[PDB]
Design a protein around this ligand. Structure first.
Ligand SMILES: O=C(O)c1ccc(-c2oc3c(Br)cc(Br)cc3c(=O)c2O)cc1
Ligand SMILES: [Cl-]
Ligand SMILES: [Cl-]
Ligand SMILES: [Cl-]
Length: 334
């Protein structure tokens, strides 16, 4: 009888209550700036980021960052720009300063604010227990904000989290896969990187929502406190679900599948087989001991749920005891 419909628990009708021009990016007329205002200085990313440059705005001598976009469809260009513009000014969202196009090649490029970067993938050797809690909370600020603005990021991972550890600042970047949430809409499941894909993507359930981002966040958290990168290390798309199943157990997976009347490939059921749930305690060793706590484990348990509707919202997450002291400390110092 086909899959059972699903709706976001929160922020369900955000885009519905806003004017059409807010979310209808296909009708958005892009107002391009002048590329001549910007001169490229050098390459950024140290070999991990393509077509990202430090640049200078010669109209005010301000240092900026330029990302040159890969040849995708015009529709996806409008989408990213529209979303960045709608989210501009939000807490811990990267700030789009301008958009330009090359005179002759007509190659589009985004101009961002300049922020220092100690790569999140290279920062776990000097990251204490409090540090992980702090930065996780900052990520949640961004996710709660964009969700409340009717937007799913759909590509949450360490690579897309820029961290300036000196000033303890954080920015969520690369909104190229982001989309607007509309209740009842079916979305493409070919999003996110394999290690951070939620179960809904891996079983081809298209009517997902903001909670997708919360799974990805759980994967990041698991990786950092257990010192295992990535935590769910699938070698292909089937193996990704298998390795999730080896931790969460197959019992809750099949219940999830039945709940939304999802139909898997016949061979997939044989592949998944039968696995018991591992207690989160079993991934703790003497070298990740100092990053693990009862509240950390409880928090992780409530993010990594098969059922996307059962996962904590960003706001629910921010009020979890895992952040109790972090919240108190931030509220009296800044
Ligand atoms: O939306 C994007 O795809 C997107 C990519 C890179 C930056 C981006 O990257 C930096 C890197 Br990589 C190194 C250093 Br140092 C600084 C930045 C920076 O300030 C900055 O905005 C921002 C946004
Ligand atoms: Cl989509
Ligand atoms: Cl694994
Ligand atoms: Cl949320």
């Amino acid at each position: 009888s086909g899959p059972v419909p699903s709706r976001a628990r929160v922020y369900t009708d955000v885009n519905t209550h806003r004017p059409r021009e807010y979310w209808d990016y296909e009708s958005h007329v892009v107002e391009w700036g002048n590329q001549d205002d910007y001169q490229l200085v050098r390459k950024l990313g140290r070999g991990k980021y393509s077509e990202v440059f430090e640049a200078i705005n010669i109209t005010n001598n301000e240092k900026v960052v330029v990302k040159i976009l890969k040849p995708v469809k015009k529709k996806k260009i409008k989408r990213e720009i529209k979303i960045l513009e709608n989210l501009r000014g939000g807490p811990n969202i990267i700030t789009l300063a301008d958009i330009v196009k090359d005179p002759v090649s007509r190659t589009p490029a985004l101009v961002f604010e300049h922020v220092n970067n100690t790569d999140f993938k290279q920062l776990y050797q000097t990251l204490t227990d409090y540090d992980i809690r702090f930065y996780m909370y900052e990520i949640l600020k961004a996710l709660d904000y964009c969700h409340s603005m009717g937007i799913m990021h759909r590509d949450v991972k360490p690579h897309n989290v820029m961290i300036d550890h000196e000033h303890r600042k954080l920015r969520l970047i690369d909104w190229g896969l982001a989309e607007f949430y509309h209740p009842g809409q079916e979305y493409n499941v070919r999003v996110a990187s394999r290690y951070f894909k939620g179960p809904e993507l891996l079983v081809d359930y298209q009517m997902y929502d903001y909670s997708l981002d919360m799974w990805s966040l759980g994967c990041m958290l698991a990786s950092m406190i257990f010192r295992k990168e990535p935590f769910f290390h699938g070698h292909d798309n089937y193996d990704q679900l298998v390795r999730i199943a080896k931790v969460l157990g197959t019992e809750d997976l099949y219940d999830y599948i039945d709940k939304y009347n999802i139909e898997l490939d016949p061979r997939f059921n044989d592949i998944l087989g039968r696995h018991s749930r591992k207690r989160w305690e079993r991934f703790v060793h003497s070298e990740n001991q100092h990053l693990v706590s009862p509240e950390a484990l409880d928090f992780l348990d409530k993010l990594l749920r098969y059922d996307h509707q059962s996962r904590l919202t960003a706001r629910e997450a921010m009020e979890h005891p895992y952040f109790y002291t972090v919240v108190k400390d931030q509220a009296r110092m800044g």
